[PDB]
Design a protein around this motif. Structure first.
Motif, PDB file in Angstrom:
ATOM      1  N   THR A 155     -68.891  30.929  49.331  1.00 34.60           N
ATOM      2  CA  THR A 155     -68.391  29.563  49.370  1.00 34.60           C
ATOM      3  C   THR A 155     -69.496  28.524  49.414  1.00 34.60           C
ATOM      4  N   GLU A 156     -70.759  28.933  49.436  1.00 35.69           N
ATOM      5  CA  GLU A 156     -71.859  27.985  49.527  1.00 35.69           C
ATOM      6  C   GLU A 156     -72.725  27.993  48.274  1.00 35.69           C
ATOM      7  N   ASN A 157     -72.161  28.407  47.149  1.00 35.45           N
ATOM      8  CA  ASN A 157     -72.856  28.246  45.886  1.00 35.45           C
ATOM      9  C   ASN A 157     -72.873  26.769  45.501  1.00 35.45           C
ATOM     10  N   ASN A 194     -86.400  20.171  51.803  1.00 31.52           N
ATOM     11  CA  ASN A 194     -85.332  20.586  50.904  1.00 31.52           C
ATOM     12  C   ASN A 194     -85.042  22.073  51.091  1.00 31.52           C
ATOM     13  N   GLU A 195     -83.777  22.456  50.950  1.00 30.78           N
ATOM     14  CA  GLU A 195     -83.375  23.842  51.107  1.00 30.78           C
ATOM     15  C   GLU A 195     -83.241  24.477  49.736  1.00 30.78           C
ATOM     16  N   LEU A 196     -83.646  25.733  49.638  1.00 37.15           N
ATOM     17  CA  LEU A 196     -83.570  26.475  48.390  1.00 37.15           C
ATOM     18  C   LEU A 196     -82.313  27.327  48.404  1.00 37.15           C
ATOM     19  N   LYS A 197     -81.468  27.136  47.400  1.00 42.85           N
ATOM     20  CA  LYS A 197     -80.209  27.847  47.292  1.00 42.85           C
ATOM     21  C   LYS A 197     -80.224  28.746  46.067  1.00 42.85           C
ATOM     22  N   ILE A 198     -79.485  29.845  46.155  1.00 47.73           N
ATOM     23  CA  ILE A 198     -79.264  30.735  45.030  1.00 47.73           C
ATOM     24  C   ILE A 198     -77.772  30.755  44.738  1.00 47.73           C
ATOM     25  N   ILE A 199     -77.421  31.269  43.566  1.00 46.62           N
ATOM     26  CA  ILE A 199     -76.028  31.457  43.187  1.00 46.62           C
ATOM     27  C   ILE A 199     -75.753  32.947  43.109  1.00 46.62           C
ATOM     28  N   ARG A 200     -74.761  33.404  43.868  1.00 49.35           N
ATOM     29  CA  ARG A 200     -74.427  34.816  43.941  1.00 49.35           C
ATOM     30  C   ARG A 200     -72.969  35.027  43.551  1.00 49.35           C
ATOM     31  N   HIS A 201     -72.736  35.957  42.633  1.00 51.51           N
ATOM     32  CA  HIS A 201     -71.382  36.370  42.268  1.00 51.51           C
ATOM     33  C   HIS A 201     -71.023  37.707  42.914  1.00 51.51           C
ATOM     34  N   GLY A 229     -67.354  48.760  49.343  1.00 49.82           N
ATOM     35  CA  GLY A 229     -68.625  48.102  49.170  1.00 49.82           C
ATOM     36  C   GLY A 229     -68.485  46.759  48.477  1.00 49.82           C
ATOM     37  N   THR A 230     -69.503  45.929  48.671  1.00 52.65           N
ATOM     38  CA  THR A 230     -69.578  44.611  48.057  1.00 52.65           C
ATOM     39  C   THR A 230     -70.822  44.581  47.187  1.00 52.65           C
ATOM     40  N   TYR A 231     -70.629  44.504  45.878  1.00 51.37           N
ATOM     41  CA  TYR A 231     -71.750  44.495  44.948  1.00 51.37           C
ATOM     42  C   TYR A 231     -72.413  43.130  44.989  1.00 51.37           C
ATOM     43  N   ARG A 281     -87.437  36.215  50.035  1.00 47.99           N
ATOM     44  CA  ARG A 281     -87.549  35.685  51.386  1.00 47.99           C
ATOM     45  C   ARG A 281     -86.219  35.763  52.122  1.00 47.99           C
ATOM     46  N   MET A 282     -85.102  35.652  51.399  1.00 50.16           N
ATOM     47  CA  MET A 282     -83.801  35.896  52.021  1.00 50.16           C
ATOM     48  C   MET A 282     -83.656  37.356  52.442  1.00 50.16           C
ATOM     49  N   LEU A 283     -84.111  38.278  51.593  1.00 53.14           N
ATOM     50  CA  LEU A 283     -84.078  39.693  51.941  1.00 53.14           C
ATOM     51  C   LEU A 283     -85.054  40.016  53.062  1.00 53.14           C
TER      52      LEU A 283
END
Ligand code: HEM
Ligand code: HEM
Ligand code: HEM
Ligand code: HEM
Ligand code: HEM
Lengths: 309, 309, 309, 309, 309
Positions: free
Chosen positions: A147-149, A230-237, A250-252, A265-267
């Motif tokens: 929900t934060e894309n 500034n915050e760095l965002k990614i888009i995840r499907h 599981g969640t791919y 850096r998120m990982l």
């Protein structure tokens, strides 16, 4: 003028992820099919154009050094296996990633059927998941997922490469991670404990208060602040999959980003963790099975590939 | 700043094509209704705005020399009747073309009802077709129709005029061709013979192999290569029509393009044919009945028409 | 780079308008919730993202002088109460406006439920309407409502502020007016009399002829010509509401504009009227109950508010 | 008064078939969950009641002699393995069949998630297929599947048992057969050869002429005439499944019938074949993998089970 | 042959409940409009017949003794006000109930607009609620509402009167109860405490275990066992309503039943409670505001009313 691949698309009710490794000496066979992919997409998905069939072709590091000559993407490298304190993020070999998404399962299945048999015998499909979609975009944990894309400008500068690498203007980097989280401990866990895990609520997905949200929560660790502010965002499907015959739920995870330093850096905030919080609370339940770093080119790059070395 | 007419729209399940010729001395009557068209579209189609009622006003050469003063579009001319070796492409007189498209038949019918009775007595409707749409965008031949229309940048530079003619920046050229192909010989023909006709498959619409595809196929003759290496594409909203009471089964071809040289070279590749292949295989079954070359202006051009000469 | 608030959205089948006044000394409580609004929108509306939940936060003059330091919007002022010859346009105190719109009532209701209880005790909700939507976008008068909103360039320059005020590039001005028009006199009135009232037809919403349309009609008085010849348009999301238990049948007018001079000149053409026609014919039946002038900021402005004075 | 299980339902876009065998000495654990199934269906599928979540509980012969006392269905027996001349129809052990069907994959997945964990540890899921649905109800062969299911009276007397067995008035018999037909030989086969295989056309699914249709076609062999002249029909919800990572493309056949003699005579017309035509032409490509004969009881029978022996 | 009123209908996304009391001496005015109601329903709801506009006319005891002569329904009486130990269930005067339900708010609003103005001046509308519907049929408590309504035979014998009263064969009894439960204490309450309140889960609405479910839960107290062993069920179309401007968040309970003894025993299990559990746990949060007992007649009974006494 560089048209990007359809990564800036809404989440679809069905999805097919295909991590296929290229066999040895079958370079020109995939070099045939790589311009044919957008043609196959426009060929199949035009049957019911209100299903929005959209393929995202992605290419790893080995397939880049094999398939393409000329330049190289600057941060394209094999996916760094994160051997943390307790949780390990492995990296299976996978050359190319086929990310397929549409309103129904069948047209994704037919596009994938025509994809490997346009390059028949050249590839072995290492990872085969049919990602479906829960009620209100939830995952198997029960929380609403993704929900934060961002949208618009904060999304195109989050994903598409500008002229910081001008030879690949437009194009992303992909981190797939097929999780196989258990439900036996998660279901016996209570709901407020799970909201300490996630960092948001479960039913209505309100983000928790900043003092109430713990430091080792998922939404607490995955937010990345820069030094300018500034915050760095990614888009995840992220699409859930699963097989009850093996008891798999599981969640791919699949994350698109402008540079893999942000996703890595998120990982690192998840597996290695913060130096205060060295573990992410969702990794107590989610164990990664696969992993890979890939590169989306433009669709013009598939239309005009560089010559085969 | 020049807003084009809604040509860059997806294929709709219902469509109405009107080729109306303007009567003699009724110039100012159509000059009244020509700014009123977008007002009528926004008036009617706002009832159910999720039907996407979109008119495409088009003006031929005679209606341009009658209705408008000042400049002229550079390649706007009467539709060159192609008297080939066996198949002839006729050109009936038609001044203006009304191309209507929406999700249902009724709102197109009501927009057309209000269109001729905004200029009542000024026009006679020469050609009246109610183009419906088959199962998965097919035509009456059985093949999926229009799956190679471009999107995005490769579509706006395919259709919209830039400043190569700066007085008409934005705007297309239209080639209507009402075909009336017989089904008695086409149905008795076998499927693989029909795939030699088309150049793609019938059920799944996969394009055939480049060596397997014959030179006189439709998809073989209609793709146009330039000398620089780029290919010129047009956007066509071909909608099937028909009347079983006369046994008519036709596909109303309508092609939008940046310049009519591209569409005319496609028609030369079909009727005149290649110097190797002088006939297109679909013209063995499809006989053109009507024909016309028109010009889409901008909607600003209908909002601000040049003064009546 | 300034991302505007989602005002350029189609009309939705359900809408919730909230005019909440801020209590004395509760400035920082609303200053907490004002960056949280887009987070709540992305949190709730991502459950069914094909409902298009979109909030439009608006701030009046008093809430601007209380909440924000630094600059001020140039034409932001309290809503000038129009005491005309017969009809009066009142202005109740309202600090902020929450304009909510989506495909269904429930997600607007839940966003409004989370909105006041993110700032619990800081506000009293002065005006509470649940605007639903009639058959083909009609209102309670029976006419199709809002069919002349512009699109594209003629809409973004109609609503979004450029650098004529560069500190608020992007952003609109809002005029809410909760009408409570009676149906007893309107229903006994005949249809053609009502088309003299509106200026367009009732069933098909064709605009009337320029000589047939009277000067005191609604569509006659509300179109504004400038001296250069361009017309100034606003975008209005007028949604009908009503309570039959009180016999109320009202249309919640809400108009977004680049500058409130345009909307105020429209209101002067209605209430004060033209110097020829001093009354608008719909104001014979519609009596305004509430009124307010507000300001939409950018979503970046809610993301980065100026510091609290 | 006997309410049957929802077998008389239209084909749904997603389906889950579960063949779970009951572990030894876990009789009362399944006897707990068997009245709970309709409660779980009404519990889960009421979330979006316009998804039509409908479970079909089925019980084999071994689970009948273990679970239920009192009477026995008259023709309930283990599935007779058909060892024909060339094609063999095997019969894996499976005690109970869970047939789930709804508009989307997720609610079937969640009903199956709650089904095995209402009887946790009592069963092992032998067969796990997620049957999706092709474009216009097609299968992987490309033909439209299941177009000759009856409706109304000719369906309820085709499936529901009357008082020829009055202890089980209402209720069917199920023949599951998980096929895994290859596509390498089927795709290289031409279309008219495939219409000799099926007996109907491929694109429009017109049944062929009675003299043109060969005797060993599928639609030729599966229609069963009686000696009085009536034909016996079954209702089949055949849903395609498949995994491209193994290259699997299968159609999960499942046939509901009033008596298993009809389905077994159809299987004898396919595998054993006619004494003229001893092979069915679709069995040249389709090899059965699993097999089982089951019994649908009424939902009243699950509500009021006979006491555990 | 007695056609019942459309009570056996699925839950609709919008609903309007109207409790109007009849003024003194206005009997024949309502006697005019009572046969006109089905005509108005077929008149309005045929515009978009896929909205399923369905009115349920209901008549209380006072309106029965005023409006109708001849017989009387056997258990029709004024709603017995339940003055329990702590919670009181009041009974405001209301003569007739107009229960409206359809896919959207507007057609219910227009049917209610035409309903009171078919009997203009004869009634005052005492209670005016516009019941909307939450995400997956939830209420404002957050739990999925109404998932245990029966279907088919177990519903028609639950609601429709047979020949135990043969003068009113077909027809129900209605218990409306407009609750106004607070959310301040309910939201601060934790989830598992709320599942002790309800008796089922919150996210997935699984019914709890019989030993885990407390005796004072809602689902524990509302299920009624008879002495023969059958359970008596009612059908309830509980729709949430609310006004945030007053901070109101209520669920308009409305229960249809064959006899009011069943609904009154459910209300005795709630307010008076069990002799072990004298309070229902949802009544700690829900306070009833209104109340009324009504009678649905057949639509034939409105078509053929008994003569006015
Ligand atoms: C283990 C499997 C994972 C699950 C089940 C999961 C699920 C979720 C959920 C439920 C949320 C909160 C809702 C939303 O904001 O999306 C969330 C947030 C997020 N996840 Fe994940 N996630 C997983 C792994 C990952 C990974 C591996 C990454 C990236 C390396 C990631 C990146 C994010 C980000 C960036 C956010 C939002 C933080 C913020 O709001 O700014 N997730 N995830
Ligand atoms: C006689 C009536 C016609 C029929 C039934 C017809 C039908 C089709 C079909 C089935 C295709 C293949 C699917 C797709 O790519 O669209 C196709 C391709 C095409 N048609 Fe037509 N067509 C007709 C006439 C024309 C005409 C008159 C033109 C233009 C002068 C034209 C332009 C094209 C083009 C450009 C393509 C695609 C070639 C490529 O893929 O690049 N067609 N048509
Ligand atoms: C009293 C309540 C009102 C009702 C019921 C109402 C309804 C309508 C209707 C039915 C139309 C014709 C259809 C369409 O073009 O929108 C219209 C036009 C319009 N209304 Fe309103 N309106 C109201 C008040 C206002 C107010 C207060 C304003 C602005 C100050 C306004 C601005 C406009 C404009 C600008 C137009 C279009 C004129 C043109 O087409 O250029 N309306 N209104
Ligand atoms: C090997 C997998 C199978 C496939 C792919 C398949 C597919 C089809 C197709 C495409 C049709 C024609 C369309 C329609 O009428 O349904 C058909 C007809 C039929 N199939 Fe199957 N089928 C299979 C196996 C079976 C089996 C095992 C049975 C029953 C024992 C069966 C019973 C029937 C019947 C009764 C018909 C219709 C005959 C008539 O129209 O009266 N099928 N099947
Ligand atoms: C105070 C407002 C009420 C609320 C918010 C409410 C809500 C609920 C909820 C959430 C359930 C569980 C889901 C379902 O089975 O429906 C339920 C069950 C039920 N409610 Fe209510 N309810 C209310 C009042 C009533 C009243 C006043 C009655 C009847 C006199 C009633 C009759 C029932 C019945 C019969 C059940 C199902 C018990 C069983 O499953 O057999 N409710 N209610």
């Amino acid at each position: 003028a560089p048209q990007p691949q359809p990564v800036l698309a809404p989440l679809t009710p069905a999805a097919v992820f295909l991590v296929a490794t290229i066999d040895e000496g079958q370079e020109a066979t995939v070099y045939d099919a790589l311009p044919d992919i957008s043609g196959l997409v426009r060929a199949i998905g035009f049957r019911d154009p209100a299903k929005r069939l959209s393929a995202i072709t992605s290419i790893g590091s080995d397939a880049w050094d094999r398939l393409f000559s000329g330049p190289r993407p600057a941060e394209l490298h094999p996916f760094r296996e994160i051997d943390g304190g307790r949780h390990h993020a492995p990296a299976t070999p996978g050359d190319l990633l086929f990310h397929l998404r549409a309103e129904s399962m069948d047209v994704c299945f037919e596009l994938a059927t025509k994809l490997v048999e346009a390059m028949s015998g050249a590839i072995t499909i290492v990872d085969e998941t049919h990602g479906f979609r829960f009620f209100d975009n939830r995952d198997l944990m029960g929380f609403v997922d993704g929900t934060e894309n961002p949208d618009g400008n904060l999304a195109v500068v989050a994903t598409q490469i500008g002229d910081e690498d001008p030879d690949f203007a437009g194009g992303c980097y992909v981190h797939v991670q097929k999780y196989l989280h258990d439900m036996a401990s998660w279901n016996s866990l209570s709901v407020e404990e799970q909201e300490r895990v996630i960092g948001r609520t479960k039913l209505d997905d309100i983000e928790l208060d900043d003092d109430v949200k713990p430091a080792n929560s998922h939404v607490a660790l995955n937010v990345i602040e820069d030094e300018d502010g500034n915050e760095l965002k990614i888009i995840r499907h992220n699409m859930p999959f699963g097989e009850i015959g093996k008891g798999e739920f599981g969640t791919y995870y699949i994350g698109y980003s402008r540079t893999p330093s942000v996703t890595e850096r998120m990982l690192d905030n998840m597996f290695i963790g913060d130096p205060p919080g060295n573990t992410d609370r969702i990794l107590d339940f989610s164990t990664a099975i696969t992993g890979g770093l890939f590169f989306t080119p433009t669709v013009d790059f598939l239309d005009d590939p560089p010559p085969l070395p």
